Amino acid sequence: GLTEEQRMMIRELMDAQMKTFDTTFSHFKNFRLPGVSREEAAKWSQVRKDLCSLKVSLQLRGEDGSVWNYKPPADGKEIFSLLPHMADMSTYMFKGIISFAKVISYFRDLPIEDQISLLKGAAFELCQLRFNTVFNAETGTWECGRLSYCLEDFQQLLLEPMLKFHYMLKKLQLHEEEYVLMQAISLFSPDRPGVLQHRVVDQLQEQFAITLKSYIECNRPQPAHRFLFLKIMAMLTELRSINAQHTQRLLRIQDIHPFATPLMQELFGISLTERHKILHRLLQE
Amino acid sequence: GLTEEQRMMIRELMDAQMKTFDTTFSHFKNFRLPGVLREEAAKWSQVRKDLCSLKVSLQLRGEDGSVWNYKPPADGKEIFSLLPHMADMSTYMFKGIISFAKVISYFRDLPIEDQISLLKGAAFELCQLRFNTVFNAETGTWECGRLSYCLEDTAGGFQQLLLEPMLKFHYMLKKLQLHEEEYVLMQAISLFSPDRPGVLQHRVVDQLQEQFAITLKSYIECNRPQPAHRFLFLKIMAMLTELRSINAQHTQRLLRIQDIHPFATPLMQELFGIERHKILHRLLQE
Ligand SMILES: CCC[C@H](CC)Oc1ccc(C(=O)OC)cc1NC(=O)c1nnn(-c2cc(OC)ccc2OC)c1C
Ligand SMILES: CCC[C@H](CC)Oc1ccc(C(=O)OC)cc1NC(=O)c1nnn(-c2cc(OC)ccc2OC)c1C
Structure with missing residues (x-):
């Protein structure tokens, strides 16, 4: 089985996922909806290639049972319609x-700078x-409660990494x-840009990885997926x-069509604390 | 051929249609849309049967080429979602x-009360x-410019739609x-119906209707092949x-839907009887 600390580690991560993952997306409200220069022109071509790779239709399911469906147009600024x-x-x-x-x-005890760097x-x-976890592979649709994002028309899709x-x-x-252990292993990556306590994050990631390795061996005997741990790490x-x-x-699309919210701007490149005021505020509550 | 009076009649009706029928619906703007989210029971039961008879999806094509589609919900008050x-x-x-x-x-010379009665x-x-004229029979869709109203797919298929008269x-x-x-002659024959409720000049309207009908009859004789269109005029009148x-x-x-769920605009209330025609009088005076 798992050690006392390993089981408590999984118990804390699972409780964290339940408290903070709005799977029904019930509290995602007040969002935007579509239809509701030579240096610039050169940057447009690459942005058009980036947007045609991920084209999804939008589905809004009402409480009464009605459905509003948005089919995106064909490629001007019309290819930016879903960005807001x-x-x-x-x-x-x-x-x-x-x-x-x-x-x-383990994340709360880290310095506020490393908490900022790891989340970034x-x-x-x-x-x-x-x-x-909300992706339906049979329908190619991310089912986010009353919202749904359906990929538009396979080997061409699989080319997109x-x-x-x-x-x-x-x-x-x-x-x-x-899943929640994958999130822990990814969150505590020691070689993120701007990480100071490189060793203590490396040590925390090793404990989360060993726990995932031990969990799979204790709960997954089916040869359905052998080497599951190493496949996950890959x-x-x-x-x-x-x-x-x-x-x-x-960043390329933001350069010619600004859409990033103030929280996203801190998440990208748009002194660590001063450059991330919103992240610092959210990390205090 | 047609007489000069009959050709002038058709010419006046076609000009009437061209000036007043926005076929692309370009000037139909600011309309409302469904949101993104014992005896009283007898009125409701009949109204639920009344509103399940016509089930359409709403389609709005944007200028950039995007398409918003609305599929109505299944049968509360949600069966009213398309009424506004x-x-x-x-x-x-x-x-x-x-x-x-x-x-x-011929319409303007009639008394104003007959004008209102014929319009109602x-x-x-x-x-x-x-x-x-904007109905696509192959897709079951009324194509109204950027707006489209499409008959919803049903397990009964095409024969299911024929249940609704x-x-x-x-x-x-x-x-x-x-x-x-x-088409424009059919509208004239329908508009000048002498046996509408509240018509006074019954003989004048009846005489106007017969001239439109004779004109349509002569048009079909002169502009359509004789063999297969022998009864087209009679089929049209039927x-x-x-x-x-x-x-x-x-x-x-x-009226049943209005009785339990008010939705008619002020002009519609004057049209269905819901000083009695204040808006109609203003529109006819412009
Ligand atoms: C709701 C389901 C979305 C689906 C799931 C995989 O995927 C799409 C489908 C379609 C589109 C699209 O048609 O758009 C015009 C865009 C995305 N997906 C992101 O828009 C996106 N997903 N993650 N991030 C992101 C988040 C960050 O912090 C949390 C930081 C950087 C990020 O990206 C570099 C973005 C902008
Ligand atoms: C959009 C046009 C295509 C299709 C053709 C039948 O239309 C519908 C489609 C769907 C519905 C529907 O799903 O309903 C919930 C309702 C209607 N159609 C009327 O709603 C309607 N069409 N004509 N009139 C009307 C107009 C009058 O003066 C101009 C006077 C009386 C009238 O009716 C008694 C109405 C209220």
Whole structure:
């Protein structure tokens, strides 16, 4: 079995996930909706390539049973139509991740600078891990309560590394304990930009990784997924590569079409404490 | 061929239609839309049967090419979700019909009370005739510019739609493949109905209706192949007779819905009887 500290470690992470992951997205309100220069022109071409890779239709299910469905247009600024909404979704998700990190005892004891640096480097990764738990691989749809995001028209989709990540991770059929441990391992990455206490974060990540390794051996005897632990660690390595690629994508689009919310601006590159006033405020409550 | 008086009649009606029928619905703006979220029971039960008869989805195409689609909920008060939009659409269509009648010389010379009585009796029918020209029978969709109203997919399929006499009328009328001139002549024959409630100059209106009918009869004889269009005029007049029965049915349906859930605009209230025609008098005086 697991040690007393290992079981309590999983118990704390699971309680954190329940307190801070709004799976029904019931409290995601007041969001935006679509339809509701030579140096600049050159940067547009690359931004158009970034936006056509992830094209989803939007579905809004009302309490009465009615459904409002948004089908995106074909490629001007029309390819930016979903950005103000996705910014509000990302910002809403990031607030839940910030709250997730705050209740973890190992994260709360860290200096405020390292708390800022770890959340900055892992925000995208923990959000994709949370999005994968509501991803329907049969329909290609992220089901976020009354909101749904359906991929628009497979081997072309799998070429997109972010979409391939969600299909591959969903195929592993992970439990909630394995997702929340993946979030812990990703959150406590010691080699994030700006981390000071490099060794103590490295030591915390090793305890979360050993706990995941021990959990799988004690709760997963089915050969359904052999080497599940090493497969998970490979997905986290791939998730770090996708994080760098898509963080560059957002900066390119933000350069010619500003959409990032004030919380996202601190999350990207738009003295550590002074440059992250909102993150510092949220991390105090 | 047609006589000069009959050609001038068709020419006046086509100009009336061109000036007053916004076929692209470009000037239908600021309309409302469904949100993003013992004896009283007998009124409700009949109204639930009344509102389940016509089930459409709403489609709004944006200028950039995007498409917002609204699928109505399944049968509370949610079965009313489309009423404010339909009240806006109907009010807009009725104004175009009033303007249509207002430029017809034979209509303006009638007494003002007969003008109001003819409009109240024919508003639904001229609205349905205009809607039929933008009805796509292959997709079951009224294409109104950037707005589209599509019959919802049902387990009964196409035969299910034919249960509603209103829908059967649109498919049957579209099957005739009528010209623009025949549509505008149908509207004139419907508008000048001498047996509407409250009509005083019964003989004058009846004589005006027969001239429009004779003109339509002569148009079909002179501009359509003799063999297969031998009874098109009689088929059209039978469609107008059936459209009048559907008018009586759906007017009663609207009054029942209004009795338990008010939705009619001020102009619609004057149209269904819900000084009595203050807005109608102003519109006819402009
Ligand atoms: C709700 C389900 C969304 C789906 C799930 C994978 O995926 C999309 C589908 C479609 C689109 C799209 O059609 O848009 C126009 C965009 C995204 N996805 C992000 O918009 C996005 N997901 N994560 N992040 C992000 C978050 C960060 O902090 C938390 C930091 C950086 C980030 O990105 C570099 C973003 C902007
Ligand atoms: C959008 C147009 C296409 C289709 C053709 C039948 O229309 C509907 C589609 C769906 C519905 C519906 O799903 O309902 C909840 C209702 C209507 N249609 C009227 O709502 C309506 N059409 N004509 N009139 C009306 C107008 C009058 O003066 C102009 C006078 C009386 C009238 O009716 C008694 C109404 C209220």
